[PDB]
C-alpha cells in the first residue's frame, strides 16, 4: 500500500491494521499487554522472520514454526476470503427494509 496513489493506500493500510486483531486478541485473552507484544512483533517482522508470533507461556514472542504451532494454509485462506466477502456484502448495502410481520399470533 505504500506504493499506490493514495485513495486505495489508506484503505489497504486499514486492511493491514485490521489483520493485527488476531495477535492482539490472543494477548488480551492471555492477560498480556497487547501493545508491547504487537510492537515487538511488528519490529521483528519488519527486520526479518516470517513465523514470529505470540508465545503464550513465556509472555513474549517466539518463532512459532519452530514452536510447532502449525495450521494448514487453507484455514487462513478461507478465513480471509470469507471475511472479505462478508465485509464487502455488508458495506455494499445502503438501505434496509423490514416488511410488517404476517401471522403474528
Amino acid at each position: 500500500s505504500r506504493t499506490i496513489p493514495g485513495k486505495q493506500q489508506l484503505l489497504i493500510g486499514a486492511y493491514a491494521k485490521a489483520l493485527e486483531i488476531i495477535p492482539r486478541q490472543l494477548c488480551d485473552n492471555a492477560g498480556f499487554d497487547a501493545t508491547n507484544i504487537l510492537n515487538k512483533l511488528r519490529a521483528r517482522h519488519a527486520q526479518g522472520g516470517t513465523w514470529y508470533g505470540v508465545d503464550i507461556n513465556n509472555e513474549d514472542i517466539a518463532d512459532n514454526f519452530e514452536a510447532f504451532v502449525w495450521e494448514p494454509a487453507m484455514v487462513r485462506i478461507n478465513a480471509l476470503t470469507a471475511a472479505s466477502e462478508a465485509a464487502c456484502l455488508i458495506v455494499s448495502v445502503d438501505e434496509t427494509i423490514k416488511n410488517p410481520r404476517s401471522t403474528v399470533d
Partner: peptide, 17 residues
Amino acid sequence: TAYGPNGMNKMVINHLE
C-alpha cells in the same frame, strides 16, 4: 439507487422473515 454498476444492494425482509 440500485440502478447501474454502482447501484447499492438493499436488504429486504418480507413477511416471512
